[PDB]
């Protein structure tokens, strides 16, 4: 069949591998996307080190790298037009060049045979899936992807942008008419303005990040499209938490049967609300023996390995309330609420 160098002059052959050596990489389509995002990210601190010596050289530093990711793209550009127009002919038109550089790619070293009109539609959603993943990863850091993390990202600029206006008592409107120009922390200033928007981004991609997931969903094509029309991100997102509660198989049958599903039973219910109780109840036993602390990690342990319970989670918990007051287990429903 084909390879992944087919279609591809020797010369560019050369530019990957010469490429690969200074950038100190494994070329791939979402890997350029990934360092993009990297490099986009890094610019921005540069700004603030100070040393003008360090900035300025950094600063070029970097633009040399991009320069190398596009002449890098620029090869991939070609080698996907051709396997296009070689094997995809009638759809050619139908995909946008980073799609097909993206395609092309996977086709080669990750396919046997060839996809085939539909197949090849489905391939796309997998970088679609791939590139959002890692972009909300990377801004987020250490918050967990979520509507919620990303806000909680966004207020922690907010606040280091109304206090560090404080400080120089200089207003919204101040920064706007770019009063700050000649300050020490005008860069400062930008910063946090910019990683603002970062986050605005973010908030989009998710919702995109999300509405791929929740397709698969639904498998009435058309009640999807209604669903899609009156709900806003948040319900997108309280779904979401929905599903990775119940499973995708039950949560599908779940809203085209119209019918509620508990995820566990009666019995196990009571001990799930039980334990969630002795946790609470041994958490703020003060000056905790060691085997305090293991105690209290064994039985997190258990209830996560016998029962799929994530107490740290919270969502688990979340949706537990949920399905008690559905089913009307007053037992744990109370118990929870002890808790709560
Ligand atoms: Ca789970």
Redesign the pocket.
């Known amino acids: 069949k084909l390879n992944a160098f087919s279609y591809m002059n020797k010369s560019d052959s050369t530019t990957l591998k010469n490429m690969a050596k200074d950038l100190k990489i494994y070329v791939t389509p979402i890997n350029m996307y990934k360092e993009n995002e990297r490099l986009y990210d890094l610019k921005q601190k540069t700004s603030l080190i100070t040393d003008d010596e360090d900035r300025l050289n950094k600063i070029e530093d970097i633009e040399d790298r991009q320069k190398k990711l596009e002449s890098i793209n620029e090869v991939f550009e070609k080698q996907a037009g051709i396997f296009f127009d070689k094997n995809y002919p009638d759809q050619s038109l139908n995909y946008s060049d980073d799609e097909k550089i993206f395609i092309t790619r996977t086709i080669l070293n990750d396919r046997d045979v060839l996809p085939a009109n539909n197949e090849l539609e489905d391939i796309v959603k997998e970088k679609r899936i791939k590139e959002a993943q890692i972009s909300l990863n990377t801004v987020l850091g250490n918050r967990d992807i979520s509507l919620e993390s990303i806000a909680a990202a966004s207020n922690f600029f907010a606040d280091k942008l109304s206090n560090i206006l404080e400080k120089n008592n200089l207003s919204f409107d101040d920064v706007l008419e770019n009063k700050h120009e000649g300050m020490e922390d005008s860069l400062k200033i930008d910063y946090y303005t910019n990683k603002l928007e970062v986050f605005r981004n973010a908030e989009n991609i998710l919702e995109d990040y999300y509405d791929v997931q929740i397709k698969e969903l639904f498998t009435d094509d058309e009640d999807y499209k209604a669903f899609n029309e009156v709900t806003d991100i948040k319900e997108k997102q309280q779904l979401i938490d929905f599903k ?2 119940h499973g995708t198989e039950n949560t599908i049958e779940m809203l085209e049967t119209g019918n509620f599903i508990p995820k566990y039973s009666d019995e196990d219910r009571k001990y799930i609300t039980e334990q969630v109780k002795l946790l609470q109840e041994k958490e703020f036993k003060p000056n905790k023996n060691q085997h305090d602390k293991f105690v209290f990690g064994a039985i997190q342990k258990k209830l996560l390995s016998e029962y ?3 107490y740290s ?1 919270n ?2 918990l979340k949706h537990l309330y949920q399905e008690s007051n559905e089913v009307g287990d007053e037992i744990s429903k109370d118990n929870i609420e002890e808790f709560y």
């Open positions: 990775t509660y799929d319970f994530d989670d969502n688990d």
